[PDB]
Amino acid sequence: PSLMREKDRDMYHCYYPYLFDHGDKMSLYPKIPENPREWQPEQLQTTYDAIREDKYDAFIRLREKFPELYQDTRAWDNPPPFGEFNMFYSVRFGMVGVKAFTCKDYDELGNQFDCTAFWFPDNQVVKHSTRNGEVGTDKVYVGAMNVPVEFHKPHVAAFYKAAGVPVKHVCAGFPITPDAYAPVGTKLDVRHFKPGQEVTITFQNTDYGFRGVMFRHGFDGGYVWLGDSRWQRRPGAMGTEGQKRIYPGHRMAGQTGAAAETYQGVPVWRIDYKNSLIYLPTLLDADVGTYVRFSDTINTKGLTLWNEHRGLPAFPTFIPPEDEDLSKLATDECQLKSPPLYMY
Amino acid sequence: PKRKKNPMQLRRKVYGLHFKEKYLKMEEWYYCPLCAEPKKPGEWCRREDCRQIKP
Amino acid sequence: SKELRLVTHNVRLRTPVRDRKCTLQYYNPIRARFVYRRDKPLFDKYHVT
Amino acid sequence: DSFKEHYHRVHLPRRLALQRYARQQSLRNAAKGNVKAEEVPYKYNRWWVNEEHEFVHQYAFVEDPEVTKAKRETLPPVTRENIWKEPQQTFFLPFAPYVRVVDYPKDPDAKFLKPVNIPRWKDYMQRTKPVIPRTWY
Amino acid sequence: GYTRERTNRHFFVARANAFFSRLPIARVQRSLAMEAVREGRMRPWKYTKEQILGAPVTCNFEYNPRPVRLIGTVMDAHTEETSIKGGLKVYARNEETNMMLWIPPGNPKLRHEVTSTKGSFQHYLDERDKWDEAWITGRARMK
Amino acid sequence: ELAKAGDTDSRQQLAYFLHDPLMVDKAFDEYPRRFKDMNAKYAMMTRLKSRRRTDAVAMYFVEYKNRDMSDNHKGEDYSAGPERFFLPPRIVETEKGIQR
RNA sequence: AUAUAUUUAAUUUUUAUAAUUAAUAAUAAUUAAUAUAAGUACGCAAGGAUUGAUUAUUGAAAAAAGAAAGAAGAAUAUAAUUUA
RNA sequence: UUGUUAAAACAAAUAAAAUAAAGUAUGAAUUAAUAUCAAAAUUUUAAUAAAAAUUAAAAAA
Ligand SMILES: [Mg+2]
Ligand SMILES: [Zn+2]
């Protein structure tokens, strides 16, 4: 972004009337030293300056008289209170889904998208955790896939007992801002996501076991070389270094797959809020049944995801109305498709 | 370049988990309620009683 | 100093038997997989759910 | 154990102890029977003009413990029908579209007859950020 | 120096193949197929492989200005009933130009209609021999 | 499953796949009455605790479930082999009167 | 055209839970051409502008706590598809 | 993929799939100066210096 040195924060560079602290009440003049001896020999203690007084007075008059012309200048005071969704500060926790199956869809322009459908069985806000109460060090754990008591291990069933939330199979933590909390035990409906929304997903790809160096890196594994030794560009003298050891990171044969793979910024295709299904046009590598985790993409192309031009999120979390009954509502009625998009 | 290894290098293998879990490890066993023999849970006897019901 | 520790030894004369306590009723990861495993072809006359 | 690793390993408990000592001053107030949250001075000087004569806006955000407790305890209100129904836009529309055609000028090729309210190509290309007064998109 | 390739994290290693039973996935497939049918991107079909194999078909690919039409002979049908999977193998010959296409159903810019569910295995064999001879001639002229 | 089907093509296939057509006929004669009242998992495998000496490999005893309800084998003892390997298998005293 | 040591690639088997600390500027020197920018300044004419957004590679980067001699399948991808 | 012939066949050769070649017992031989052997970088001394010095910190199977 635009470089702005802290030393350039003088009143001759401020866009609004620079206000000095001056104890409890803001003032338009630097704090005059209470002890007169502290007055530096060339420091000009200003008590009343007609220039600044007139400028500030005209500014306040115009702001109070023409609210429509000076609406954008209102952010100088009465800032947005804490708790409301913010475009650059409010991040919300994602969800935990299960890769259900794969299919293919078509848009109205004619493009074919090989999509995969994930299923969100029972998303419930299980826990809150902050470390020593610092800033931005708080996160929300969300649990999924309710199970009976005879399923989990004793030491995890003990935690679920201590929490009181119904015992879930999996539990993933999302780091969020304090104004995006949700009470423990809150059910998360899939409509928490929007169809025209970019999502970042994390999963575990399939396991292939020990594979050859050819199969691991493809054509890249055959030729692996790196030399940081000095070499003479011109025949003037003689001097070089011997590459004694092998540099760390050498591409060899080993474990393949079974790792934490993260896709960043995939758009949602469609949402079914009766069976709790989400469709993504990207074919994944994981198996069927891998507990993927979905989170909101922060920003792409220097543009925030949640803004007035694209849309407002379901902050903090989508809560359905009372008179809505998913049992009475049919399956075909519970379909939300994203607006068209072309990628070629 | 190969050379004789001191007794300390011969005793480094027992520090790893591969040596401990292979040779020196006990069994979880109980008495077959139908044969009165030591039996591991999961493997049964040839007798007709031990095949119909798992002791 | 360490001369006291050198001159004075400490020993366990006869430790109790190394017989393992009953661990069948504790949690066991190898037996955990069989708790929800289909065992229809394992029984003939005494099928239990 | 590297130099930085040892330094952090020996200093991190000391950092936590220093933070605890700092919060002890805050707990001094609630100890006397007057539980008062920490107050932060709101800074009105956050809109600047840089050396190259362009606008910069600093972002300062505060956290309210009472609002945090309220969001922890009370459930959020019902989500808006239009908010959850209307899908989010995929492509970001430009700040100034170049229409290239206006029905007002009789001769469309007349460059002097096009109305001024239609944005220009220079704005269509350079206007990728909001204006100086308005900060948000 | 050192890195780790595998992760024994519980959230990553846990699976849900046991709990996949409470999801009517086949019903979701049928619902998607029925939505496509009601939108008109596809039309339901109930034929068997030997019945449809060898039946003439006409496919129009919509394209401004002129949608391209193509009359061919169905060589293989991948599905016997309507579904989101689908799949048809058509073979069409223009003037001195043979082509073998795999038409997927449900494409809005693609309308394929088989002129008759009934098929003639004799004409199917004729088209298959023509296609194989063309392919062999092409390969022989290449190599 | 082939015996429950009992088709001529199924019998031809089983006779192709098996070594003994006499055993093919024995199966097709005895298995329908034996497994009329069963759906699946007809055989039964039991892992024996005793391993083979030469390979230290686990052994498994695989036998059909419905032995005593309807079959040519009935009331036979498999806990131990006979006196000789060419003698008929042991028979429980409860069902010694049955004839093969 | 000999089994070695240092160094590397992995693994030490469900760990409910990533990283405020080693990767000490940057995954491209925070890009970046491109239709539309322009039949337009500049040029007698011929010809010929600076230029940055949607078309692209631009998220730059390490998931280390619980009881362990079956196949981590009772195996023909259903956590028993009825079962004597 | 190449080459030969004729208006598809043969020969070469590798890189994808598939097949096999144990986790059981039996068990040598090359080699062997050696501290529970000196992870690395810098500088230097009579030829690789694994010889010395300075930074730095290199776990176990
Ligand atoms: Mg473990
Ligand atoms: Zn027994």
Closest nucleotide C1' to the C-alpha of F36: G84
Element (H, E) at A300: strand A299-300
Distance CA E25, CA E23 (A): 6
What's at D14, amino acid-wise? Answer: R
Q: Do F48 and B43 touch (CB under 8 A)?
A: yes
Query: Which residues are A103's β-sheet partners?
Result: A115
Q: What are phi and psi of D94, to 5 degrees?
A: -65, 160
Closest nucleotide C1' to the C-alpha of A215: H16
Distance CA A101, CA E23 (A): 11
Q: Which token pair is A312?
A: 């407002």
- Chain C hits for A154, CB-CB cut-off 8 Å, are 27
What's at F80, amino acid-wise? Answer: A
B49 annotated ligand-binding residue: no
Distance CA E123, CA E52 (A): 12
Helix segments in chain E, DSSP class H: 10-13, 25-39, 49-52, 121-142
What is the full DSSP assignment across A202-228? EEEBPEEEEE-HHHHHGGGGT------
Largest CA distance in chain D: 82
Q: State whether residue F91 is helix, strand or coil.
A: strand
Residue with tokens 């025949």: A235
Residue A286's Cα: distance from chain center in Å?
Answer: 23
The answer to whether the beta carbons of residues A161 and A149 sit under 8 Å apart is no
B1 annotated ligand-binding residue: no
Residues 6+ apart with CB under 8 A from A38: none
**Number of neighbours of residue F99 by Cβ within 10 angstroms:** 5
Residue with tokens 């649990």: A143
Distance CA A309, CA C3 (A): 82
Characterize A296-330 residue by residue with b for buried, 16 or more Cβ atoms within 10 angstroms of its Cβ, and e for exposed: bbeeeeeeebbbeebbbbbbbbbbeeeeeeeeeee
Q: State whether residue A154 is helix, strand or coil.
A: helix
The answer to whether the beta carbons of residues E119 and E51 sit under 8 Å apart is yes
> What kind of experiment solved this structure?
cryo-EM
Residue D24's alpha-carbon distances to A131, A231, D31, F98, in angstroms, are 17, 61, 10, 93
Residue B10 Cβ under 7 A from any strand H atom = no
- CA Rg, chain A, in Å? 30
Residues 6+ apart with CB under 8 A from D9: D1
**Is the CB of A173 inside 8 Å of chain E's CB atoms?**
no
Residue with tokens 């055959």: A222
Å: C35 CA to G31 C1':
57
**Is the CB of A64 inside 8 Å of chain D's CB atoms?**
no
The answer to whether the beta carbons of residues B34 and B45 sit under 8 Å apart is yes
Å resolution of this model? Answer: 3.9
Element (H, E) at A88: none
Residue at the smallest CA–C1' distance to nucleotide G56: A344
Rounded to 5°, angle at Cα E48 from E46 and E49: 135
The answer to whether the beta carbons of residues A146 and A166 sit under 8 Å apart is yes
Q: Do E11 and A272 touch (CB under 8 A)?
A: no
Distance CA F34, CA F11 (A): 17
B8 annotated ligand-binding residue: no
Q: Do C35 and A150 touch (CB under 8 A)?
A: yes
Query: Which residues are F90's β-sheet partners?
Result: F77
Distance CA A119, CA E19 (A): 11
**Number of neighbours of residue A56 by Cβ within 10 angstroms:** 16
DSSP label at residue F82 = -
- Which chains share 3+ C-beta pairs under 8 angstroms with B? C, F
The answer to whether the beta carbons of residues B4 and B12 sit under 8 Å apart is no
Distance CA E111, CA E103 (A): 10
